[PDB]
């Protein structure tokens, strides 16, 4: 499978033609305030430098594999372990976030993918309700170099070629996410690439993460994908809510 062309995604996986897919256009005026949504909790995200982590150009994204012991909770009794994180981005002067807000697309987006503690493996969780949970934050331009992102972005030259990888020291993974874990949107949807399995709990932070212009350019200008083609604009088209109500942790 690829972005922007064949094969048709439902031929690869019929789940890609489901009614309840991601990503979506978040319309905050249509979101339901749900006071039961408490601040997200993370434990073990501040890693020692060793062991190192794998950072991979898989031709569709740059993906950081996370080690065991990164615990995440959506609330009391809703417990997850982090598997990996990756990015979606645009091109020079074009945004490439997956989620949009009132039709606005942001420069880029981070996804931190988690597996329910009720499942031993990802493949057992696919398609099961709440089996997988993704934390999502938009990346925008700020005035400063973001030092957490710099740890990954300074290594993209090493993995420019499709299918390459490198090892990076552990870092504070939570520093790749916004500081505000209280204010977010949450809805049920799908993986945004094949196999597009439904049952995925999406949490999208209100607060954005700030990267420098140079950083955003490094992200969109360094990696190469399938063919002799640049790895850019690696986001799925917006999927309709189709009657799903997005929840908000704030009125
Ligand atoms: C069969 O074993 C499998 C092992 C891993 C996966 N797997 C797919 C994915 C993802 C695909 C797309 C996303 S996303 N963009 O966060 O929604 S995460 N994460 N793990 C799927 C199957
Ligand atoms: Zn993603």
Three-state SS for the chain is: CCCCCCCCHHHHCHHHHCCCCCCCEECHHHCEECCCCCCCEEECCECCCCCCEEEEECCCCEEEECCCCCEEEEECCEEEEEEEEEEEECECCECCCCCEECCEECCEEEEEEEEECCCCCHHHHCCCCCCEEEEEEEEEECCCCCHHHHHHHCCHHHHCCCCCEEEECCCEHHHHCCCCCCCEEEEEEECCCCCCCEEEEEEEECCCEEECHHHHHHHHHCCECCCCCECCCCCCCCCCCCCCCCEECCC
- Binding-site residue ranges for substrate: 192-193
Q: The domain 1-251 is classified under which CATH number: 3.10.20.90, 3.10.200.10, 3.30.2420.10, 3.90.25.10?
A: 3.10.200.10
Residues bordering ligand 2, an ion, CB closer than 5 Å: 111
Residues tagged active-site = 60
**What is the Cα–Cα distance from 32 to 15, expressed in whole angstroms?**
27
The number of the ligand nearest the C-alpha atom of 89 reads: 2
Contact 249, 37 (CB under 8 A): yes
CA 23 to centroid of ligand 1, rounded, Å: 14
Residue 167, both tokens = 């090892």
The resolution, in Å, is 2.0
What is the rounded distance in angstroms from the CA atom of residue 48 to the CA atom of residue 229?
36
Q: Sign of the C-alpha dihedral, residues 85, 136, 3, 141?
A: negative
* Residue ID of nearest Cα to ligand 1 atom 10: 191
Q: Where are the domains of the chain?
A: 1-251
Q: How many CB atoms lie within 10 A of CB 123?
A: 11
Q: List residues near ligand 1 (CB under 6 A).
A: 111, 113, 122-123, 134, 191-193
Ramachandran bin of 96, using left for φ above 0, alpha for ψ from -120 to 50, beta for the remaining angles: alpha
Asked how this structure was determined, the answer is X-ray
What's the distance, Cα to Cα, between the start and end of the chain in Å?
40
Q: Which ligand is nearest to the CA of 15?
A: 1
């Amino acid at each position: 499978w690829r972005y922007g062309g064949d094969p048709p995604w439902p031929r690869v996986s019929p789940a890609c033609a489901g009614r309840f897919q991601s990503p979506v256009d978040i319309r905050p005026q249509l979101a339901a305030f749900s006071p039961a949504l408490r601040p997200l909790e993370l434990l073990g995200f501040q890693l020692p430098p060793l062991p190192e982590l794998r950072l991979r150009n898989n031709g569709h994204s740059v993906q950081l594999t996370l080690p065991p012991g990164l615990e995440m909770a959506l609330g009391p009794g809703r417990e997850y372990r982090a598997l990996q994180l990756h990015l979606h981005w645009g091109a020079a002067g074009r945004p490439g976030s997956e989620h949009t807000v009132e039709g606005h697309r942001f420069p880029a987006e981070i996804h931190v993918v988690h597996l329910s503690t009720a499942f031993a493996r990802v493949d057992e969780a696919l398609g099961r309700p709440g089996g997988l949970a993704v934390l999502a934050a938009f990346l925008e331009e700020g005035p400063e170099e973001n030092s957490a992102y710099e740890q990954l972005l300074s290594r993209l030259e090493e993995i420019a070629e499709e299918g390459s990888e490198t090892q990076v020291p552990g870092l504070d993974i939570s520093a790749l996410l916004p500081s505000d874990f209280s204010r977010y949107f949450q809805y049920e949807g799908s993986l945004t690439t094949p196999p597009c399995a439904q049952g995925v709990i999406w949490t999208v932070f209100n607060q954005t993460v700030m990267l420098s212009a140079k950083q955003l350019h490094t992200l969109s200008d360094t990696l190469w994908g399938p063919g002799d083609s640049r790895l850019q604009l690696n986001f799925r088209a917006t999927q309709p809510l189709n009657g799903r109500v997005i929840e908000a942790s704030f009125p």
